[PDB]
Every structure is written in C-alpha cells, then in structure tokens.
Design a protein around this ligand. Structure first.
Ligand SMILES: *C(c1c(C#Cc2cc(NC(=O)c3cccc(C(F)(F)F)c3)ccc2C)c2cncnc2n1CCOC)[C@@H](C#N)C(=O)NC
Length: 258
C-alpha cells in the first residue's frame, strides 16, 4: 500500500478523546507537518473491519472532507488525517468560541458542510452519521465532514429498516440545521429515543427555533419529509444556503441570538 508509513515518523504529542473504539491524538508527522491520529484498542475490535474506514477515506478527496494523509496496517493501528485547529463543531458551538456566532456565520458553515456532502452525493457514497459531532472546524471557520464511530439524528427508514441512502443523510443534515441554530443543544428537548420514533412517524417535527427565519424551518421540513425521494439534494442545498441572504432572506437583520 502506497499510503503506508514507517512508525518512526509520528510523535503522538497530546491526547484528545478515549473510548471503547480506541483513542485519538494531536501530533506531529514527519517533523514538519502537524496531524491528527486515530488509534485502535487491539482487544475491543478487529483490524480488517476497522481498516475498511480508511479504505473509504482513500477514495474521497474534497476540500470539505477531512484528508487522510497516512495509514499503519499493524497494531497499534494509526489512521492519520490532517489536523483541524478548533475541534468538533459541537464543541465549537457550545463553547465560548461560539457565544457570538450569528446566523451569517452559521449559514456559511452549513453551506460548506453541504458542498462537501454534495460531493459525497456526487460520488454515490453515504455517510450514515451526519451530525455536528462529526463536523470539524479549522481556521477562518472552515468546516469539514468526519466520521468516528444514535436515533435523533437519523431518518426513520434508516433507524428502522436500515435503508441508509444519501436521503437519510439529507434528513440528518436537516437535524444538523437545528444544532447550528441552537448553539449546539440536543434536538427533541425532554424527549427520549423511543418517544422520538413515535412522534416522528406520527408526523411530529421540530418548530422553527427562536428568532430563526422560517425560510430555514421550511428547509429543515424539506430535509424531513417522510417520502425520501422528495427530500432535496446536497446540490440544491449547497446553492440554497450559499445564496441564502441574497435570494431567500435579504430582509434579515440580527438580534439577541441570531
Ligand atoms: C479525534 C479527532 C480527530 C480525528 C480524526 C479522524 C477521523 C477519521 N474519520 C473520517 O474523517 C472519515 C471516516 C470515514 C468516512 C469519512 C467521510 F466519508 F465522511 F469522508 C470520514 C479517521 C481518522 C481520524 C484520525 C481530529 C482532527 N483534527 C482535530 N481534532 C480532532 N479530534 C478530536 C475530536 O474533538 C474532541 C476523533 C477521531 N477520529 C475522535 O476520536 N473523537 C472522539
């Protein structure tokens, strides 16, 4: 494999997140270039299964996807991507860093995520796990799509019958629109996973947030139609939020929170 790397090239400087899947670290590869690294706990999971993740990352390059730099096929395993300076989007929004992110900033992010997903769309691949916990931010509020390793953020047909399409990713993206607009709170407040599947299949969807323009709530409701083929594309979503403040909501003025 030409992606492969000799083990002596990686300083694993600082630790970041642990778990039953392994762990990930901030570090320095090749002396020069700073990088993120994901390990594997040899006891908990298998090599050929955990390495099918990298397989996918190999065949995907796009400026709004996290870039796999390198791999290490022997335990302890190391999948090695670029490093993103500002951590998870979830952490960013709840964080003091995003006490002051007004709609303008938030909608641009959604546009960059969208573009990247519109790429995934173009490549006939499927994420199965789109939510602010798997979006990374870097300098200038660049956002990128990741995948580390359930039901509020995924569409019914997927949760139930396992029909995980790109249209399951559109739904969740709609739910991600609620994270960006709430400063990274959880969806379905005072609701728990089994009460969610009822209300949703019964037809319950979330209301337009405080001070979030209804244009965005309608977009979410396009994201969350039950008939999947009549949810919109990431091609359309991208162009939509790209033009949001010129074409859809140019009246817009800020306020307390958005
Ligand atoms: C730790 C972490 C990282 C990182 C990383 C990382 C991610 C991935 N996964 C992908 O990006 C991916 C896999 C499959 C498919 C796709 C698709 F299709 F969407 F493109 C993407 C593989 C390997 C690695 C190393 C990271 C990077 N920069 C800054 N901080 C980072 N952190 C810390 C997280 O914030 C606290 C992350 C992982 N992995 C983790 O374990 N979180 C708990």
């Amino acid at each position: 494999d030409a992606w492969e790397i000799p083990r002596e090239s990686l300083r694993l400087e600082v630790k970041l997140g642990q778990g039953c899947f392994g762990e990930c670290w901030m570090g320095t590869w090749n002396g020069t270039t700073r990088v993120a690294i994901k390990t594997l706990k040899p006891g908990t999971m298998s090599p050929e299964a955990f390495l099918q993740e990298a397989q996918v990352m190999k065949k995907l390059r796009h400026e709004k996807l996290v870039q796999l730099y390198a791999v290490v096929s022997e335990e302890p395993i190391y999948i090695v991507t670029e490093y993103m300076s500002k951590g998870s989007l979830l952490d960013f929004l709840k964080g003091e860093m995003g006490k002051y992110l007004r709609l303008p900033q938030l909608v641009d992010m959604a546009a960059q995520i969208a573009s990247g997903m519109a790429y995934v769309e173009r490549m006939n691949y499927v994420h199965r796990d789109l939510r602010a916990a798997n979006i990374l931010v870097g300098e200038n509020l660049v956002c990128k799509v990741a995948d580390f390793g359930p039901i509020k953020w995924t569409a019914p047909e997927a949760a139930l019958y396992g029909r995980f399409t790109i249209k399951s990713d559109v739904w969740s993206f709609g739910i991600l629109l609620t994270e960006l607009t709430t400063k990274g709170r959880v969806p379905y407040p005072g609701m728990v996973n089994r009460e969610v599947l009822d209300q949703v299949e019964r037809g319950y969807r979330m209301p337009c947030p405080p001070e979030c323009p209804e244009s965005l709530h309608d977009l979410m409701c396009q994201c969350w139609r039950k008939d999947p083929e009549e949810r919109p594309t990431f091609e359309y979503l991208q162009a939509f939020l790209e033009d949001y403040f010129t074409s859809t909501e140019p009246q817009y003025q800020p306020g307390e929170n958005l």
